[PDB]
């Protein structure tokens, strides 16, 4: 019955009506152990969440959970895994292998993708969940 | 011919004459792609470097490469993966899922283990190497 921290991710893409997100399941919380590292990119064998797009690198970025000091809940860190295209966390540009700790609500922009991320705090630190929502509108 | 960043790790343990480091190869640089994450612990299937010790958690900690902003070389981040035992980076205690960016030279203490870490900068950012040395003396 222990609440689980969930990272709500509202995503958008102008060509999303082409099935770019066909590999992604929406409104479905997927439990991940705190040992796991969530990866995004076009490669199905390397990434848990994949996009059918040539402009997407094999691995675009990774999200990993961690505990901030003097905090009893899970937070998340992002790291750009793309040599080619940058990764915008709000107003900040993340080059190849740059990393940042994520706030509770932020916007991810890589290429033409737009991700709105919102962290809902739970009690558990052994696991976390992910949920996706598709936006018909652009996010900015 | 491109130089590769190497993390030199001098390790010590009072019971190291029992074969705790029998699974570890010394004076051998092992190349790792910058996508990899190096893990330490007793579990052979989850960790690349393993110790035959009940007091060692399944996964003790992880080392992952990243690029500091305004820097053209690889750096490393550590994250304690042990619920049970803390992880000392120099004078700092890292609890469960706490993380820190490593300096060029630091000391790792978990349980009765002692790791001296020294980063030798290379040119490559697509890969990094690891090398181990066993110390007959304690490190502090």
Author numbering:
A (entry chain A), B (entry chain A): 10 to 149
Lines from the paper:
Full-length mouse TIFA with a C-terminal His tag was crystallised not only to reveal the structure of mouse TIFA, but also to elucidate its molecular assembly in a crystal. Mouse TIFA is composed of twelve β-strands (β-1 to β-12) and adapts a β-sandwich structure. Electron densities of nine N-terminal residues (Met1 to Thr9) including the phosphorylation site, and 43 C-terminal residues including the TRAF6-binding motif (from Gln150 to Leu184 and His tag) are missing, which indicates flexibility of the N- and C-terminal regions in the crystal. The overall structure is very similar to that of human TIFA, except for the region between β-1 and β-2 (from Ser27 to Ser37 in mouse TIFA) with root mean square deviation (r.m.s.d.) of 0.7 Å for the corresponding 128 Cα atoms. In the region between β-1 and β-2, structural diversity between mouse and human TIFA is observed due to either a deletion or an insertion in the amino acid sequence. The overall structure of the dimer is very similar to that of human TIFA, with r.m.s.d. of 0.9 Å for the corresponding 256 Cα atoms. The dimer of mouse TIFA, related by a crystallographic two-fold symmetry, is formed by van der Waals contacts and hydrogen bonding interactions at β-5, β-6, and β-9. In the centre of the dimer interface, a hydrogen bonding network is formed between Lys108, Glu86, and Asp110. In addition, there are hydrogen bonds between Gln73 residues, between Ser43 and Tyr105, between Lys88 and Pro74 (main chain), and between Asn107 and Lys76 (main chain). In total, fourteen hydrogen bonds appear to contribute to the dimer formation.
TRAF-interacting protein with a forkhead-associated (FHA) domain (TIFA) was originally identified as an adaptor protein that interacts with TRAF2 and TRAF61–3. TIFA has an FHA domain, involved in its binding to phosphothreonine (pThr), and has a consensus TRAF6-binding motif [PXEXX(Ar/Ac); Ar, aromatic; Ac, acidic; X, any] at the C-terminus for interaction with the TRAF-C domain of TRAF6 (TRAF6-C). Furthermore, oligomeric forms of TIFA promote oligomerisation and polyubiquitination of TRAF6, leading to the activation of IκB kinase (IKK). TIFA exists as an intrinsic dimer, and phosphorylation of TIFA at Thr9 promotes its oligomerisation through the intermolecular interaction of pThr9 with the FHA domain between the dimers.
